[PDB]
C-alpha cells in the first residue's frame, strides 16, 4: 500500500463542539497540525491513514492562550533564593494551555530578554506555541536589540512590551518615557506584523490607571493596544478597569488572585457592566510570585466557576481564555476552531475537566497526564 | 457537502519524477503545503477536495535553492548609480527558485542587514522560503544585534555569516578576526539550530584559499562550515577549490560567471576530479554585478545537453547538495514530510509550472503570483 | 588536654546590661564572634577555654552603628588641598563604632565608588563591619556597574544610594531623575536583600524636604526608605523633619553639627513631638567637612547629654545609635544584644565613657585605646 | 535554665575520621557552623546544649568541593530545547557536595553571569558554600562589570575566569587575548583576595595544551593559576596534562567522562606518573551535557575498591587538593577553625548524613533541607 502517514491525518469525531461558539455534535478533521474540516458527520474513510478517535459524549473546545507567564522563572523580591524555576512544558499543557505569552517581572538584573526568547523557542520546538514581551517592570526597557521599537519589529517571537506602573516595585517612569515606550511597541508592531501591545503591570497605588489615561493624552497610541493586568487586585482599580474597558480598552484579569475580586467574579462583573467579552482576557501570571510558585490551575477553575456558579454558557466562559486573547494579540490561526486554524484543541468531559490536549496536531495530554514533556522534566 | 478545501489538496500525477534521484513515473500528493505521499499511481479520489493535475509526459523535480542573492539589492562599486534594485518575487519563481539565501556584498554603508532581514521576511509571506547571511565583505562584520554569534543565534532568519577574502574590495581581514568570526557563526548556529556557516567571497588574489587554510590552523571550526564562492572566477583559484573539496569541504560555483571556468565546466571538472556532487553547489549571485537567475536553469540544461550529466545528477548542485549544506530541513528533496516546493518541466527541461509550499507560483512559465508592487 | 581555643569562648560577666533594652546585672557568653547566651549568672566553667572577663560595676551595651561616614575621605569644596584623608580603624572603634555605612559627598570626580568599596572591605577584614552607599551628591548617580538598581542588587556591600537635594552643591536633579533613582535603589534592594534605602543630603534651601514629598507623589517608593540627613542644620528644616517622621519616615540627625539645633536637643524634640525613637537615627558625618576634618566623638557625647541633661534613660539614648539604625537598614545581627546576634559590644562606666570595645568577638579597645589598628596606622 | 542553643552545639563522636589524612576514631565538636575541636574522646557534656550524635562504626570526612558546575543551567548546543535546568540544592547535598564553584559553558547568549551570581548567592543562603567563575567559553569574556580583572576584583563571589581552548566551540581566541584574560584574573584575584585562576575548557583539538604553553611565554602569570579541565577527554591530551602537572601545574579531571580515560583511571595514572595528588582535582561538570553528581562519590568508591588507593588519598582530589588550589580558606580539611562541612559515610563509603556549615543537610541519605522550590 501507499504511505500517507506524513499527513498525520486525525479525525476527532462525536464530541459536542465549542469553537468556542456553541456548535452541536460536530466533527474535526486534522491534517498536518491544521484543522482542515469542521462539520457534523465526517466519513471516517474520507482520508487514508486517518487516526480516528471517538470523542463520543465528550466536549471539544479550543486550547487555552495564556498571555502572562514567567517562562524562565520570576520572583526574587525576597532575595536570590526566591528566584523561581523555569516553567515545565507539561505543567502548561495539563492546564489546557496550548499558546502562551512570556514576560519578565520585577527582576531584570538576573533575568534577561535573550533567556526568555530561547525558552520561548524551546516550547515552540517541544510542540506548543510561545511568544514573549520584551522589557520588564523597569522603564526605560532593558531590551534585546537596543530599542523597544526594534525588538517588536525584528525579533520574531516578540509581540510587544511589558512594564509596571502604580506599583512600589516600579521604575518610577514619567508619562514621557511611558508614552515613548508604548509608541515604539506600536510602530514596531506595525513593521513586524505583531500586535505591538503594551502590557501594564498594575500595582496598588491609589493613582490606579492614571498613568495610562495620561499617556493617551500625551500621544496617539490606540487604546486597544494598552492592556492593564491584575486589574482585580483591589476594588477601586477593578472599578476603574471597568471604566477603561468601557472606553474601548481590553482588560486582563489574572486567575492566580482570588481577592478582593475573584477571577470568575471579575469576568462576571465585566459583563454586568456592559463590556463585550471580546475586551476581557484572563491570564494566569504563571510561575511567578512558604513563598510558593504560582501555577496554572486557576484558569480552568475560572471557566468551571463561570459555568457552575454564574450562568455563563460553556461557549462564553471559554472566550476570555480563547477567542478574546487571540483577537487582542492578533494570534492568527488561534483561539478559533474553524478550517485553516491550528489544531490546538482540548478534550474534556461535560463537567469541564481536561482529558486530552492537542497542540498543532500532536497529543500532549493522553489521560489528563502529559504523554509529551520538556527535554529534562 | 462538507468543506475540505482548507487542506488545499493537490495531486501531481503521471510525471517523470526526479527527487532528484531518478524515480520513474511517480505521483505526488500534496496537502497543506506538504508532500504527504510519494508512490506511483495514487487515487485521484484518495482525498476529498483534491485539485488533480495531469502532468503526463512532464518532468517533476524539486525547486531550486539559490544561496547567493542580493535580495535588497547590491552593486554600488562605481558610485550610487550602480546600486542595483531589489529582487522581484516573479523573477525568482520564474527561474525555478523556491528557496533562497539573501546576503549583502561590497556595499555595507547604504545596505543594512535590517533591510535584508525585512526583505527576507517579506518574501516568505509572499510564498517562497527565504533566509539570510549576516555581515558583508567587511570584517569585522556589521551585524544587527552586536555580534555575529548573537545574530546567527537569535535572529530567526540568519543561518550564518558572510565576508570577503583574497579580494581587492575586502577590509583586509587578519587570521584572528577571520577565525573569531567563523567561530561565532558556528557557535551561534548551534544555539539557534542554524548551519552556522561562513561564506567567503573569493577575489582574484594570488593568495586564493590561503586565508581559509590559515583559519583552520588557528581554530577548530569544522571544514564543513567554510564555504568559498566564485571559485570559478580564475583557474588557479578553481584548482585550489577542488583540492579544498577533496578534503571534505564544499565549494560554491557561481552561475553568473562564464569564464575562465563556466558553470557547467565547473560542476563537470569537479566530478572528473572525483568529488562527490554532495560537496558541490551552484549559486547565482543574482541582482549583483545587473545579474539574473536565468543562468541557474541554463547550467542544468547545458549539463544534461552539452556535457554528459544525467538529469538527476545535474539537479543536485542546485538542490539536495545545497539543502544538505545549510541543513535546510525539508527541502531540495521530494519525500513525504518535505515541503511541496516543485518544478514541472518539459522533457527538454523548460520550467512550465512552479510550486512553492503548495501554492502555485508559475502557470505558463510566467509567474501568476507576484510581489506586492511588481 | 583537648584544645577548644578555636571557639574563642569569652564570658562577659557582672555588668549592668543594656541591649539596649534595660536588663539588669546580666551576663553575655560569646563564641565564634557571636552572642550565644544572655542570662544572669552564667557559670564560668560552662564552656572550655572560656576567657572570663569580670565587668563587675561596668555597663555593657551594643556597639555603635554609624550610617554616615566618609571612609575614603571627603571635602575638597575649597580646592584639592581640602581633600580629607581616609578614616582610621581605631578612630572609629575608640568612638564605640562597630558598624559603619560609608558614602561619598560633594566630590565624585576624585572620589570613586570602587574606592569606597575596597575600603569598606578593608575595615571588614580588620575586624569591624562596614557597608556603603553607591552614588554621591551628583544625580544621576555615578555608579559601579552602570545602574543604581544593579549596584544595590549585585554589589554585596552596597545597601542603598546617596544624593543631595536643596543644597547649593547639588546636581540640580528634577523629581524625575530623583524618583527613578530612589526606585532603583528600592528594587535592587529587594533583589539583593538590602535595605535599598535612599539617603538625602539636606542643604539649606528654603524648599527643605519639598523634593522628597514631590517624589512620594511621583512614584511608590515607601516613605520608610527615604532618609533625610543633617535635618538639624536649620530650624525650619528640622521642623519639617519632625512632620516627615510623623508621616512614617525615619529622620537622621548628625552629631557633628551643634547649631541651630544640637544633636541631643534634636533627638529630644523628636520625642516631644511624638515620634517613636525607632524612627530617629543619629549619624556622625565622620571624616568629611583651620578647615578641620570631622571626628566621631560627638556621637557618645550625645548619648551622654541625653542621659545627663535631658532625662532619657541609658536604654533610650542608645537606641538612635543602635537598635534604631539596625532596624532602618535591616542590619541583621546588629544593634541588639540577644542570642544569635554578633558580639559587637562596648564596655563602659556608669558615667558612660568607653573602656572596652568588642567587634565580632575580638577586642578592639583594651583601655580606651585601640589594641587593634589599621594595617598602616 | 539558661538558653545556649544559639550556639547550635553538635558533637560527632566515635567515627573513623579522615580529614582526609587518616586519623583514628576521632571526635569533632562543632559550634556556630565551625569545627571548634578535634581530639579523640570528647565529653558529651563539655559544652551546654550539645546535640550529641553517635557515629560509632561510621566514617567521617570533609564534604566534597565540586569546582565545575553549571549552577543556573547549561547545554543549548543543539537548539533551545537542549538548555539544561538549574541545579537543585538537594541534588548537590545528596552527592556529598558542600562547596561548589559555578560557571557558564558554551551558551553565553541565553545564560548571563548576573544570573549565576544570583544562583550562587541563593545557594549560600540555603546552607552551602558557593562561588563562581566569570566569563564562558567565549573570549574576550562577557563579564558583569566590564573587565575580568574588575569582576574577580570587586564582585564578591567571583574567584577567577573561565574560557575555552582547543575546542570546536570556542571563539577562536589568540594568545594575546588569552594571556591578557588570565593576567586580569590574576591581578583581580590579588585585589580581591581571590585565587584569580583561569579555568580552560579543553576540547578535542590536536593542539591540546599548546595554547596554555603559548600563554606562559607571552606573560608571567604563575603556572599555578592555569587549570585545564576535561583532560581525560582524549588520551593524547591527557598525556600532555600529566606532563603539565609534572611541571607544577594542576589538572582537573571530570568525573562525568568515562572514556577514553575514566575518572578513577585518571587519578590513578597521575599517581603512577608520579604527580603529588596535591596537583590533581576532580570536577563533575554537573548539569552540563544532563550530567549528574553521582560520579563524584563513585570515583572515590571505585578508587578505594577497584584500584588500590586508600580512603584518605582517594578523598584528596575532591577536597584538600581542590581547597588548596582555589585557596578556599577553612574547607576541604577537618581542623579547629575550619568550616563544619562534613560527610558521615558507612564503612563502604555510602553517604548517610551530610553537614554544611553546621546545619544538617542529608539525614537518611536523602536531603532534609531543600531549595525554596523543589
UniProtKB/Swiss-Prot annotation, chains A, C:
Cofactor binding note from Swiss-Prot or TrEMBL: Binds 2 Zn(2+) ions per subunit. Has highest activity with Zn(2+) ions, but is also active with Co(2+) ions.
Enzyme class: hydrolase
Modified residues (N6-carboxylysine): 162
Annotated substrate binding sites: 75-77, 106, 137, 169, 233, 289
Recorded family membership: Belongs to the peptidase M38 family.
Principal cellular location given in the protein's record: cytoplasm
Effect ascribed to mutating residue 233 to K: Reduces activity 1000-fold
Amino-acid positions noted as binding Zn(2+) 2 in the UniProt annotation, renumbered to this chain: 162, 201, 230
Cellular component annotations (GO), alphabetically ordered: cytoplasm; cytosol
Summary of activators and inhibitors of this protein: P-hydroxymercuribenzoate causes a slight inhibition (8 to 17 %). Iodoacetamide, o-iodosobenzoate and ammonium persulfate do not inhibit the enzyme activity.
Stated pH dependence: Optimum pH is 7.5. Active over a wide pH range.
Phenotypic consequence of gene deletion: No observable phenotype. Does not result in reduced stationary phase or heat shock survival. Approximately 31% of the enzyme activity present.
PTM entry text: Carboxylation allows a single lysine to coordinate two zinc ions.
Residue positions binding Zn(2+) 1: 68, 70, 162, 285
Subcellular location: Cytoplasm
Outcome after substituting residue 77 to D/Q: Reduces activity 100000-fold
Gene Ontology terms for molecular function: beta-aspartyl-peptidase activity; hydrolase activity, acting on carbon-nitrogen (but not peptide) bonds; identical protein binding; metallopeptidase activity; zinc ion binding
Keywords: Cobalt, Cytoplasm, Hydrolase, Metal-binding, Metalloprotease, Protease, Zinc
Gene symbol of the encoding locus: iadA
Record protein name field: Isoaspartyl dipeptidase
GO aspect biological process, one term: proteolysis
Cofactor: Zn(2+); Co(2+)
Active site: 285
Enzyme Commission code: 3.4.19.-
Reported function: Catalyzes the hydrolytic cleavage of a subset of L-isoaspartyl (L-beta-aspartyl) dipeptides. Used to degrade proteins damaged by L-isoaspartyl residues formation. The best substrate for the enzyme reported thus far is iso-Asp-Leu.
Amino acid at each position: 500500500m501507499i504511505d500517507y502517514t506524513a499527513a498525520g491525518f486525525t479525525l476527532l469525531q462525536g464530541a459536542h463542539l465549542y469553537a468556542p461558539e456553541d456548535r452541536g455534535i460536530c466533527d474535526v478533521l486534522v491534517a498536518n497540525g491544521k484543522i482542515i474540516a469542521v462539520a457534523s458527520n465526517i466519513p471516517s474513510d474520507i482520508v487514508p491513514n486517518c487516526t480516528v478517535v471517538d470523542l463520543s459524549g465528550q466536549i471539544l473546545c479550543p486550547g487555552f492562550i495564556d498571555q502572562h507567564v514567567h517562562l524562565i522563572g520570576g520572583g526574587g523580591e525576597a532575595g536570590p533564593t526566591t528566584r523561581t524555576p523555569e516553567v515545565a512544558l507539561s505543567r502548561l499543557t495539563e492546564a489546557g494551555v496550548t499558546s502562551v505569552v512570556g514576560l519578565l517581572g520585577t527582576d531584570s538584573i538576573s533575568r534577561h530578554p535573550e533567556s526568555l526568547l530561547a525558552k520561548t523557542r524551546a516550547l515552540n520546538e517541544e510542540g506548543i506555541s510561545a511568544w514573549m514581551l520584551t522589557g520588564a517592570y523597569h522603564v526605560p526597557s532593558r531590551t534585546i536589540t537596543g530599542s523597544v521599537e526594534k525588538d517588536v519589529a525584528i525579533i520574531d517571537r516578540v509581540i510587544g512590551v511589558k512594564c509596571a506602573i502604580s506599583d512600589h516595585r516600579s521604575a518610577a517612569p514619567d508619562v514621557y518615557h511611558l508614552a515613548n515606550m508604548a509608541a515604539e511597541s506600536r510602530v514596531g508592531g506595525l513593521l513586524g506584523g505583531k500586535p505591538g501591545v503594551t502590557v501594564f503591570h498594575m500595582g496598588d497605588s491609589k493613582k490606579a490607571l492614571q498613568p495610562i489615561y495620561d499617556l493617551l493624552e500625551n500621544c496617539d497610541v490606540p487604546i486597544s493596544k494598552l492592556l492593564p493586568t491584575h486589574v482585580n487586585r483591589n476594588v477601586p482599580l477593578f472599578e476603574q478597569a471597568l471604566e477603561f474597558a468601557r472606553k474601548g480598552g481590553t482588560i486582563d484579569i489574572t486567575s492566580s488572585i482570588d481577592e478582593p475580586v475573584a477571577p470568575a467574579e471579575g469576568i462576571a462583573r465585566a459583563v454586568q457592566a456592559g463590556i463585550p467579552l471580546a475586551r476581557v482576557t484572563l491570564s494566569s501570571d504563571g510561575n511567578g510570585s512558604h513563598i510558593g510558585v504560582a501555577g496554572f490551575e486557576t484558569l480552568l477553575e475560572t471557566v468551571q466557576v463561570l459555568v457552575k456558579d454564574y450562568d455563563f454558557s460553556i461557549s462564553d466562559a471559554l472566550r476570555p481564555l480563547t477567542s478574546s486573547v487571540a483577537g487582542f494579540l492578533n494570534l492568527t490561526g488561534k483561539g478559533e476552531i474553524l478550517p485553516g486554524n491550528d489544531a490546538d484543541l482540548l478534550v474534556m468531559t461535560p463537567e469541564l475537566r481536561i482529558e486530552q490536549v492537542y497542540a498543532r496536531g500532536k497529543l500532549m495530554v493522553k489521560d489528563g497526564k502529559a504523554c509529551v514533556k520538556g527535554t529534562f522534566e
